[PDB]
Unconditional design. Structure first.
Lengths: 160, 162, 165, 162, 165, 173
């Protein structure tokens, strides 16, 4: 009535904001042309029983949609690579992942987040850290959470 | 086309600081049946000076705070405190050091207070003074206050708190 | 579990970590004896007109001892000095105060340190809160608040919560 | 020289700066117009072997100069009041001060600082908190240290601000 | 005017204040000659099939000089070491890279310190912004971003802004 | 002892704040190359393989699931595993490899079970002290900033086996 909480930008301060981003990643392995490929197959290709033996390198350019249907509203790509890092895994596989997200659509059109984290696919919820970012996401500090082709993503990141 | 939302840091356990604009009118009633201030102790050179408040006078006050400049508007709080005349020249362009607190009555900040110790020359249009601290919703306050001018002053208060 | 992790002070990397300190003491107000700790410093001009023991516009000066416990015998660890002003024109017995006082501790870690306070004191309130407006000593750069507890020659329980370095 | 340290405002951040202010406060009692008057002596004047009994109130307008000589460059004035909070003894007076510093001349022209704290005049060094400030000292969190050298006390002021 | 004031560093009172620094150097990617600065550590499986020189899934590993000025003969600042991968299925000339690399600095105050980087990179875009993911040495707790500028062998202009202590 | 009792210094969580902590972590990384059950693989050979004189030629790519123990013995209490990759990145180097690594420590045991840190940095294996940044974390280690410091306890520079000791300093909430 006689008071309002305003933005520190009024007095010229650059407060940090917390931003929750939601989207779906589609790693597509079957199709006329898919989205990820084996950049270098694992030396134990012949011996392991795993479809992706220890030490496979995969690179990927997965689209990011607003909802779980593939033809949902595109908002960005996830580009980068993962690497198979569980010697014992056969199907329940474990990955280290180095991907960046690039967004197109809205405030964050052009802004990118970077990730490097450990993803053990069998887990219901999988947590990797938001390493940093560009554009609006400069000075990013945060994490993400992937549930599970198409994976639900929940990103929380501090920036300005 | 909205895959994002700027959530509050409280969602993750953090307690970010906030900036609040407070706006209200202060009523120094000097004449009438019960006035709002009184001269708790007078300057030992009262008759000598042509000033109504010779250097070294001490007024105590209790001025109501209203949403609008009419005294009848919604009363949101009150200023209590004192001030000291601090210019020797003086006469009518008085200079005061004021120590005073604001209490509020209703709203988010029902019951919270703000304290201020500062300096104003009444003759100037903008007078700035600091928010030295606060209680309640205004714990840990740090900010400033801008006053615009039997009397009614316009107050703009910018506070950081949590 | 043998343990391979411990939390350390940010001191070890040269940072000056902000600490929150909880200070607990009793403030005795001796109105008896040949040396009272308080005094009306400037009575109100409406002294005779009003029925209050301390009418609108009175000014009190105080020099009160601070002890670790509620008995005066307990360790003297400080002293509050300052002043306050009655700021209710209505009040007869339900006084409203503005206080400008500073706590100087003579005690342990904080011997020589001070906290300053300017705030409001409704004397009907069972728990009254005032803000820590700044400090010196270990209490340099202090931000915080303060809570005084007492119902209506006595004493008063202080709990202080003050961030500093 | 392939690298250089830049201020955070290049990226639009409002970084906090630590400022050291040096000046001399002049405490004039002798002469045709001094700088402090006794606004209210205590009800224990004669009953006290003391020039300022417990409970005296003094109001002050003191000039702040660059050097120790009243003639040196004038940069501001201290205004406010202080209250004698020590009983008996005397010469060993202890005072709680509420004053503000208003600065002329400089990048801090028209800016103020506020102080409320405890002055044991005996002490060689006396420390007091900077409780808030205005102008360029909005949100000031700091302290000052006064060194006891008519009088002229050396002040050294250490203020965080934006 | 005789100035009565001065700004100090907060370390005068013990604090370890954030610092923001600009670093400006040139990175040279010699892809041609007797000794280049990178090699194709793992060729992409779709070599014959793709038209681009560096097909999706290629891994390059680099150890590139950093100079203060754009001539390779310029004063040497440090190394950029690391890897990148081509992350665009359709690109033929307008490639897209996810890059992972470090900068060792042998120069002045920052001798021995490192910064890390992991981000996107559109080779043909004029301004290429990548995050500073962290750092060692003086750049512990590094936080920032970096901008690379080139044109439609090589040398690329680098401007990095980093917060640290 | 005495006059010491009226002040107590407490967690700013008592007032709802989430103060950042500084955590020191100490473990031993075990780099097993030779023998029947090793923790490494050369996911891709350097094209320099035949020509170069280094055991791990420039442009090799390794992938590792190294174990983390509290003490120097491999028999010691297992506290985590390090997983990821690195690339050889010095062309002059023969024995004194230069590595760029990207890797994650997942911890099993105690306060930090399931929490990860992630690391991307240079390490110059011959240095007596190798510093590498902590680039982010998860679980209890969300919003992590910090750095490692690895020191070689035992090491064979021809066969590649190592017992490295790590000391990580990380800030978080």
């Amino acid at each position: 009535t006689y008071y309002q909480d305003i933005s520190p930008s009024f007095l010229g301060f650059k407060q940090e904001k917390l931003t929750h981003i939601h989207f779906f990643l589609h790693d597509i392995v079957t199709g006329p042309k898919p989205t990820m490929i084996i950049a270098s197959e694992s030396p134990l290709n012949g011996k392991s029983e795993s479809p992706l033996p220890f030490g496979s390198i995969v690179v990927l350019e997965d689209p990011l949609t607003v909802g779980p249907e593939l033809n949902s509203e595109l908002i960005g790509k996830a580009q980068g690579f993962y690497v198979t890092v569980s010697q014992a895994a056969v199907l329940e596989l474990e990955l280290v992942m180095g991907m960046t997200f690039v967004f197109t659509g809205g405030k964050y059109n052009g802004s990118t987040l970077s990730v490097l984290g450990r993803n053990e696919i069998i887990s219901p919820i999988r947590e990797m850290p938001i390493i940093g970012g560009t554009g609006e996401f400069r000075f990013a500090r945060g994490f993400l959470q992937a549930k599970s082709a198409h994976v639900e993503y929940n990103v929380y990141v501090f920036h300005y």
